Curated annotation (Swiss-Prot), chain B:
Disulfide bonds join 33-75, 226-228, 315-331, 369-376. Activated by quisqualate > glutamate > ibotenate > trans-1- aminocyclopentyl-1,3-dicarboxylate; inhibited by 2-amino-3-phosphonopropionate. Belongs to the G-protein coupled receptor 3 family. This is Metabotropic glutamate receptor 1. Changing residue 75 to S: Impairs protein folding and abolishes location at the cell surface. L-glutamate binds at residues 40, 102, 123-125, 173, 255, 346. The gene is Grm1. It is found in: Cell membrane; Postsynaptic cell membrane; Cell projection, Dendrite. Homodimer; disulfide-linked. The PPXXF motif binds HOMER1, HOMER2 and HOMER3. Interacts with TAMALIN. Interacts with RYR1, RYR2, ITPR1, SHANK1 and SHANK3. Interacts with SIAH1. Glycans are attached at residues 64, 160, 334.
Amino acid sequence: RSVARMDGDVIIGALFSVHHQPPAEKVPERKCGEIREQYGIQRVEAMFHTLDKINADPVLLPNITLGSEIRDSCWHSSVALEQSIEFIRKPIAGVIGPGSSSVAIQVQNLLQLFDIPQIAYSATSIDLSDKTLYKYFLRVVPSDTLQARAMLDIVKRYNWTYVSAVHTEGNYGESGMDAFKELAAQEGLCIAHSDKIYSNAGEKSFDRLLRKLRERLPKARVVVCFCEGMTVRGLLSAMRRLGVVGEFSLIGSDGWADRDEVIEGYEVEANGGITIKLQSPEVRSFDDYFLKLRLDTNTRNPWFPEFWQHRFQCRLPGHLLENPNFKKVCTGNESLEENYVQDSKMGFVINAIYAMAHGLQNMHHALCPGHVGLCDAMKPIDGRKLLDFLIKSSFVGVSGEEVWFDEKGDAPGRYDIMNLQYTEANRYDYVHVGTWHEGVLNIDDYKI
Amino acid sequence: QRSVARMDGDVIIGALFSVHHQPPAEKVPERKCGEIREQYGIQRVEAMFHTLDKINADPVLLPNITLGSEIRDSCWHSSVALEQSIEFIRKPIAGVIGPGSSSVAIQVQNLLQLFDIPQIAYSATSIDLSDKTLYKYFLRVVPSDTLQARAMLDIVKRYNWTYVSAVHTEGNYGESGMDAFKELAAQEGLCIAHSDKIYSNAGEKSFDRLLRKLRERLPKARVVVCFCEGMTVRGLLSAMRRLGVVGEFSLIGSDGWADRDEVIEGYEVEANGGITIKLQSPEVRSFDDYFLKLRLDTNTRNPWFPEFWQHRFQCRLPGHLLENPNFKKVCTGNESLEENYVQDSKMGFVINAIYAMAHGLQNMHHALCPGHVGLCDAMKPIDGRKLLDFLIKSSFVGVSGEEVWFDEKGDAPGRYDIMNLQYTEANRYDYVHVGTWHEGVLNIDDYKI
Ligand SMILES: *[C@@H]1O[C@H](CO)[C@@H](O)[C@H](O)[C@H]1NC(C)=O
Ligand SMILES: *[C@@H]1O[C@H](CO)[C@@H](O)[C@H](O)[C@H]1NC(C)=O
Ligand SMILES: *[C@@H]1O[C@H](CO)[C@@H](O)[C@H](O)[C@H]1NC(C)=O
Ligand SMILES: *[C@@H]1O[C@H](CO)[C@@H](O)[C@H](O)[C@H]1NC(C)=O
Ligand SMILES: N[C@@H](CCC(=O)O)C(=O)O
Ligand SMILES: N[C@@H](CCC(=O)O)C(=O)O
Ligand SMILES: [Mg+2]
Ligand SMILES: [Mg+2]
């Protein structure tokens, strides 16, 4: 499997969903789906970019260059584990990712055996806060103990007393929904229908899911989905097949948030949806770098050629990765600015990388006092010690966010409440209608 | 540097057994295990040694090819099991026996499958493991809980009940078991009245509500199917006592209840008449003949024996690397293993899992090395992907005379005992054996119920 590398004194591993997960039938041979931009290429480039800057920075890690070994997780436990084995087969100092809680648990179960700290940028499961089971895990995002509370507050806000519940099979949906149901039970909120499903389940399964939900109408119109985006898309698609529109009031978790790829093509069935988004400021710095990448000068990113052809539905003559679905040759001058959309969690990806650097810096200050570069004490780097320095690190993120971790490796965070609506213009957009921070729900009622 | 039980041979079979209890929660990061175990540990380690000795003396099974072993401790925990599984992939292991727990077996299989190493379980019963897209290299000689659902439904249909309530304990066991029951029930025209789930540790208030919801469906739905942990049943019995009701329902429970006294202890009156399922556990006399004769000074192939002996007979071994600090008297070495002796209830499964591995290797040899006495180039090294194909199609007669074979998903047939709680001729409540579910056929003594 391809691997994006950058040499340096200390090597940082990373796991990103460069491709979609393998089709249910291909799982055994671990053959992945199509190339991804927001969750794949953009994150791979964000790592390269962040490391470039850090290595060009005189204050952070003065004479210590950070290298990398970026691997594809295909958002799947089996591929992620396969690739994590490669990390431990210069030794990896720490790992960034993967994005899924279930997948993250699989990776952490192996990494902890070699004392390799892991920092997530999107794994929000409450379970990962258990340090007896996940000692070497930390993250720059808040656990879903909060998101579940935010979701219940929204339901309470609009006096909904009877709701249906759906979650994506796996640790993220299961842990999040269990927390929500626990809160609901305390508050006396009734759950009409409850169901679960795998994001990659067949259409017949999503058909069944939808049918079961409709049967609980019209009393159970509100549907709480602690779901991955693809699970939500699977449901919209099922609504498309049955010819139904606007029957439910969907309230989704961060797997949906304000992601365009989730509702693309199904804006009609998705319209009116209310979602939760992890607050993360747009990273302009990244756009300036990313949009200037060219298919001829970007050689450090092994997947770029595959990406370009897919991004511009064109093919590369003679290229081994020539796409057999497009005829118009790639002019190699197409603009990455067309319909461009930055990964919604870009800030977290970047700050997770910076957290790793700050951990290494803090460790160097303590173990190699007065030394210029790495000293005997950090040759090799002791993962167990690096973990403690990471947990005790605090800094200002790429966009001003205060980043630090509590004893459980959890970071502070908050959410933006989004509402999908048909704007004045002939277009559907994610309107920012509110926020949830420290138990306080603020929603602009006139905006909804 | 965790100890390993070894026996060299032409082909090495790996094994993961719970030689020790899992690490206390706070000792998990350091993977420091608990107390030594006998039935789930030492007895299984010895069962493997004994079985291999027997197979190596068997003129019909692998006549001129010896089997060896690399037995590791799983401490009934995924971190230790993974730690030890890493050691297997670090002579290469042809296959792995174990581990015992489904959640732990899943973690082990996620890794083994990456190296095409077939894994055969003797006690992991999770329905999840039947998914070959996720667990291609997993097979087992113990039935999947989906067969418990089947047996329980067969019991319900036998007495022509049309409506039943359904309760299951939260978690994989309870939820998967009940989902299986419900799928079958729907397909066969059985209606579900009240349906619920609950944690065994839920409060009395929660069990009070559960009982109220069940009673609301009376008298039409007098039968309650419980795919539950024993303590969930106990919670329900406890609620019946508080409410002051008796014999209103006919409870049918999965093996979480089985024939456990701790479940009905003090609530025999409200439990009386319940029907439960239990995995059959045929005693393997030949194992006892071997195990009961083991001695401290001569058993040097089992590295955990010294520790086991000290704990088993509450004595210490002066200056031993693992000298038990809880007892002052010294072991004589002539204590008898027969005192309070109890044979691991899964012993037959453990032995048959080992025999299944041997038969898969034998079948592979016959097909890939025809005419060769020993292993030929086609089996140097053994192609795990091929061994998996041969294992799946292997069948034989087990240690207790049962027929062992696997379906396409690597699942095994199921044989359960059917119990009925009754008040015997004496002033006592006993779990009376009233039937069996023999691989699809329900045999019940209708008069005893
Ligand atoms: C440290 O790195 C800087 C790069 O800006 C270089 O100019 C300087 O000479 C280096 N110092 C040492 C002691 O290597
Ligand atoms: C919820 O119900 C209360 C009580 O009837 C009412 O005062 C409040 O305005 C309602 N809020 C919404 C959003 O409907
Ligand atoms: C194979 O094993 C049998 C059974 O003990 C033995 O009689 C025979 O001599 C062996 N063959 C060889 C070539 O060693
Ligand atoms: C179940 O119903 C069938 C059909 O009437 C009947 O033949 C059979 O005897 C019944 N069994 C019992 C145990 O009542
Ligand atoms: N927070 C989700 C991931 C959502 C997403 O990034 O799409 C998880 O922990 O799995
Ligand atoms: N069947 C249980 C294990 C039972 C036992 O041996 O204690 C499981 O799948 O985890
Ligand atoms: Mg620097
Ligand atoms: Mg033999």
